[PDB]
Design a protein around this nucleic acid. Sequence first.
DNA 1: TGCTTCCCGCGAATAACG
DNA 2: CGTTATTCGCGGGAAGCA
Length: 121
Amino acid sequence: DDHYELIVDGRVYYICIVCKRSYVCLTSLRRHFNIHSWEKKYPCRYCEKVFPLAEYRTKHEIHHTGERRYQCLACGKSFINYQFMSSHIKSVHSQDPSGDSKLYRLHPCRSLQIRQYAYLS
DNA sequence: TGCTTCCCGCGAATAACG
DNA sequence: CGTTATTCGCGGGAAGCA
Ligand SMILES: [Cl-]
Ligand SMILES: [Zn+2]
Ligand SMILES: [Zn+2]
Ligand SMILES: [Zn+2]
């Protein structure tokens, strides 16, 4: 088909037949394989760009609307994505958002319609 | 070398299935 | 519907880029 399996320590891995990338979950291998097959297109609704993963397109479109969902809870500045927020917090506040404390807020996406995680409230 | 986008395990929201 | 299968958002590290 589109993958084969490898088993080490009863550990199951799924191997893409084209690039031979490894995945713990088959849904991940299938998500990745569209990159090769393009059986599904994810077109930007704001311009003409096409993406092989839905999440790639979503990040892209958020870039179109200018919405800033990531907010530093130390000083209030907002950022378009995780990386800007994290960079800001590390440089300006000398802290790490992947540590123990909660240092940023991710607001619900409001500038466009995507699935909404209830915990973002 | 610092933005910028990619990657993939994990699991919540939702669609497809009786 | 209730249930299972599927989709895809998210973190945060990695890979790409000029
Ligand atoms: Cl905003
Ligand atoms: Zn592959
Ligand atoms: Zn676009
Ligand atoms: Zn701040």
